[PDB]
Design a binder for this molecule. Structure first.
Ligand SMILES: [Cu+2]
Ligand SMILES: [Cu+2]
Ligand code: NA
Ligand code: NA
Ligand code: NA
Ligand code: NA
Lengths: 620, 620
């Protein structure tokens, strides 16, 4: 019944049938993206229409298409041929991951470069790397991947320990042409292995860790209905899954007494980019839009009980499409559980004699994805006290290079001759806000320091100021940790019992934003990443901060073009876009496999409730 | 055998006997502080000498004394009479908490002020509040407390809901004189109660929370020997307890292969101050040094299994002195346990086919203290991967006032007529560093942005720079979140296998520091709080950032006077002092009892190890 239910295998099979019958899914076609469309605004009509958006690639060089289908009715709603030189190429296909290596293996220039290094072509892995937009005019309108080489000494070897530096190749994956092979010189291939399961490297495993048992004797406190609707400790929400964005949260609401109060209409990580800071021509083009170019949802891991998720776990297994329109289940792809979270509130009173302690807990919704060397955990947390938090966990294997004799200002040394270029991992959270409804506004809140003088004779006063953002043109904001800057999303038409507008406060981690020169290609293609906060007016087609087709797109698309409309955002249906990231100077401890590092943000109620919302929590 | 063992009841009884026999503990004397002294540097001699430092108050107006005693030998080592007008008053005594209320209850000016408000004196609680140093010349050299009044409607009522604004009194607690009563006008006493255990306010308690069971079937993975020596997952340390500082960590070291490698010699929270930002003369003097003036260790709570600490808990019960030199045990005052901490490292490799997941855990050492309205949890964490983290958890009841008709720039409204003045909670961590030994240096690390141009043609490069702090005069540093600023503590004489100095990186939360005007009394008395990082050369007598006697001390003492020595800190025995704090604009959700908010810092290895230190963690 719920329009927000996960896509079923039957729906995807129906999409396949509708596409094939319409002549849109011949043997030369590949589905590069398929996803359910959210209901339009004001869908108070039970007329449910389940619609799917499809990006269709053509392996013979014909123009790709964007297609919208209605599975409830069984029709193609629209089908548009795409001019990719104008609007961007389609996302990378899983089946193209091997094509770069196979095409280079018969190119005489590539073979000549390997022969000079005495490398057996059968042992050389080539990473399929998105190309970006740079100086090469022949790439405009062609589907290009770039390749960097790594040696595997044997089938189970970690190739990342053996980068082949000084060598890069560009390939046209549709015409099957190697356009350029660039060899800037021979670097020794680092020889130490990085096999973190080899006993010679781990030493004997510890025998000192005793088990920790986490169980729920009476089952979990949350309920799941309709496949993906969660109710937990006054929270209510729907857990969606999209092959591009991954886990998406819908209809986050809090049951306050008898009223179900909305907070967030849709929450997602709508883009993530990994720009590299090594100026070598072998790597200076590297900027991976893991979400927009590769689609993080399609590489979600199956999570193992007791290993990936510990405790009383409820799993969801989302269904996606393969390249031919067949449904594929990601078994155990989403973990959900509740966790104890320490002390919630505590006071021992010297006058009343009352001692009071309550414990906190949080609901966890998580998935893990793998994109080449990177592995990322995406965690959404809901706390008893109304707090909402997102946390990204970055691990995997660092992307490597040679370490140059004489050192580098842009590369860390990890092992003899082995380097790791500096880079960032930058995320964009898209928060379609609905604080007590859709009439919302954003205020910037700064601490205000006051001068000693009249009315402040002892020089102790301090205050704060709030600035309403009224138009999109003034809603591009930067962090200021020194002034304690935060942003409040409030509803000016909904007031608490003190007659103040209800609100939620966004707390950022205030990490550095995009470091690249503002004139660089990546600054233009990832403009969202240059500022910490953007606010737009809601529109159905403004989904991603980088636009719909990120791969090889020249720039400007997305948030800079949206905000040029300069729409009213003062008490309107608005969307907050928060940029946050990790700046990674790799350390020796990151090798040969990296311990998790984290970044995130949180939102806390700010006069949303009439008093603490956790007075009815029992004494444990 | 260990010199770092906790004080025993027998040692404190011996101190009492030594003091009394020497004529230093007559009926008019009170012990305001008693604590064990750490061993001096270079104590490679088994000649263990357990020494105690004592502050002795005199209730008859005679000069207080500072006394050092050796319990191993049974002598007074030194005894010095203190001129408190010069060097500061002694910490507040627990037995003075009631004296302010009792003295005011017979003062005609106080009674007149209560009568005008129709308040029964028997229902008026008076908080015993430290005085600071302001304009009142008669207070110099006198032991003063100030009092603010709150009404209790009945013995179990929360008085904090009923502040009596417009009224403050100053009392000399030795001469038992009320020096001043200031009445600036009648404010209505807020009438709503704040009784968070009253069913009429909580409503019916939730029945939806199912139990979470955390157990360790084979016991915990850590061992405790000699009372307070911990070994856990290659970590080694001693857990101390001091009545002023609370939990103190000694000799933090990590077992790397066959070598026990020191990291931190002594870690403590050496001061914490709560400055208030309300310019009303009723409250503009309020700055509570919860550590230096009140001593947070003496108010540590007894922690209850299943409520305060959940899981397989090992307790320590530290022993302190009462005011007469009798030993008193704080039963279950320190909790220690290990906790699962999610994913440690994870990678699924597209080329080797190997799937790898390991889980993290942390060791937790914690205590909770209560100072009037405030309750604070102090948490030290040790992680498998070498990370050390501190977290403060702030809860309790907010300090209240009236909310003025017409509003306030410096006070939040919590309930009809009830306000909460803006304030900060600022901590000072004192880290006596010992990275691979005592020859350490501090470097400031900033991200470096690079301009597009020659050698950076695509405008993508970024770098970092490190600045060594060579002398104390240049080692007073501020945060810069925008440049990703961190500080590295390294050992220039100890190198990793890449021939780089081993180090640890301090990551701050970059919260605002002291907001008061730099000319204010509190800026002078809490100078440490105006800057994020200080580095000093180690010295035995430089223990606290505010000096030994904080109460009513005029200012300048502590860190500003230490660094004036301008000592060499480049490869020397050094101490890092990190300031970090919460800026609290109270929200409605903080009332009537506040959900926990947190602040902290962490240190992570930076080329300390030759590769990841957690390759030998087993697969769970
Ligand atoms: Cu990284
Ligand atoms: Cu506070
Ligand atoms: Na274009
Ligand atoms: Na909205
Ligand atoms: Na003085
Ligand atoms: Na030191």
């Amino acid at each position: 019944a719920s329009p927000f239910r996960l896509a079923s295998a039957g729906e995807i099979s129906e999409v396949q049938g509708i596409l094939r019958t319409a002549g849109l899914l011949g043997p030369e076609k590949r589905i590069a993206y398929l996803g359910v469309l959210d209901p339009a605004r004001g869908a108070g009509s039970e007329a449910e229409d389940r619609r799917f958006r499809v990006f269709i690639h053509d392996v013979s060089g014909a123009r790709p298409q964007e297609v919208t289908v209605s599975v409830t009715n069984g029709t193609v709603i629209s089908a548009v041929e795409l001019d990719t030189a104008a609007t961007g190429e389609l996302p990378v296909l899983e089946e193209e991951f091997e094509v770069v290596e196979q095409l280079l293996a018969t190119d005489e220039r590539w073979l000549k470069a390997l022969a000079a290094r005495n490398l057996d072509v059968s042992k050389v892995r080539v990473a399929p790397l998105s190309a970006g937009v740079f100086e090469y005019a022949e790439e405009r309108g062609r589907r290009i991947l770039r390749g960097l080489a790594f040696v595997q000494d044997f089938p189970e070897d970690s190739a990342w320990a053996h980068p082949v530096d000084g060598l890069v190749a560009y390939v046209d994956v549709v015409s099957k042409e190697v356009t350029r092979v660039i060899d800037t010189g021979v670097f020794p291939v680092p020889a130490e292995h990085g096999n973190y399961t080899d006993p010679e490297l781990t030493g004997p495993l510890r025998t000192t860790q005793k088990p920790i048992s986490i169980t729920q004797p009476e089952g979990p406190s949350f309920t799941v209905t309709g496949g993906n609707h969660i109710e937990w400790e006054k929270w209510s929400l729907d857990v969606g899954f999209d092959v591009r964005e991954g886990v998406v949260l819908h209809n986050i609401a809090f049951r306050d007494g008898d009223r179900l109060r909305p907070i967030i209409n849709r929450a997602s990580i709508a883009e993530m980019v990994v720009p590299y800071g090594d100026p070598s021509p072998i790597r200076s083009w590297q900027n991976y839009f893991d979400t927009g170019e590769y689609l993080v949802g399609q590489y979600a891991n199956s999570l193992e009980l007791g290993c990936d998720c510990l405790g009383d776990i409820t799993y969801l297994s989302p269904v996606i499409s393969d390249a031919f329109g067949n449904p594929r289940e990601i078994r155990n792809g989403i973990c959900m559980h509740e966790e104890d979270w320490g002390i919630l509130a505590k006071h021992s009173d010297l006058w009343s004699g009352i001692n009071y302690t309550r414990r906190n807990r949080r609901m966890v919704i998580s998935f893990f994805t793998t994109i080449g060397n990177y592995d990322y955990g995406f965690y959404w947390y809901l706390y008893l006290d109304g707090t909402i938090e997102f946390e990204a966990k970055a691990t995997g294997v660092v992307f490597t290079s040679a370490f140059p004799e004489g050192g580098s200002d842009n590369i860390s040394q990890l092992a003899p001759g082995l380097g790791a270029p500096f880079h960032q991992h930058i995320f964009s959270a898209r928060l379609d806000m609905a604080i007590d409804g859709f009439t919302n506004r954003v205020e910037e809140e700064d601490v205000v320091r006051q001068t000693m003088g009249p009315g402040n004779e002892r020089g102790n006063a301090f205050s704060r100021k709030r600035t309403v953002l009224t138009r999109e043109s003034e809603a591009v904001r930067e962090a200021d940790a020194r002034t304690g800057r935060t942003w409040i999303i409030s509803n000016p038409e909904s007031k608490n019992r003190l007659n103040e507008p209800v609100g939620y406060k966004l707390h950022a981690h205030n990490q550095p934003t995009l470091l690249a020169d503002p004139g660089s290609s990546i600054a233009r293609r990832a403009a969202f990443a240059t500022k910490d906060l953007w606010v737009t007016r809601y529109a159905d087609d403004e989904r991603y901060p980088t636009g719909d087709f990120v791969n090889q797109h020249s720039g400007g698309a997305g948030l800079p073009s949206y905000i040029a409309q300069d729409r009213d955002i003062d008490g309107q249906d608005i969307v907050v876009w928060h940029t946050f990231g990790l700046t990674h100077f790799p350390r020796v401890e990151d090798w040969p496999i990296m311990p998790v590092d984290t970044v995130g943000f949180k939102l806390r109620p700010e006069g949303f409730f009439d008093r603490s919302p956790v007075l009815d929590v029992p004494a444990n």
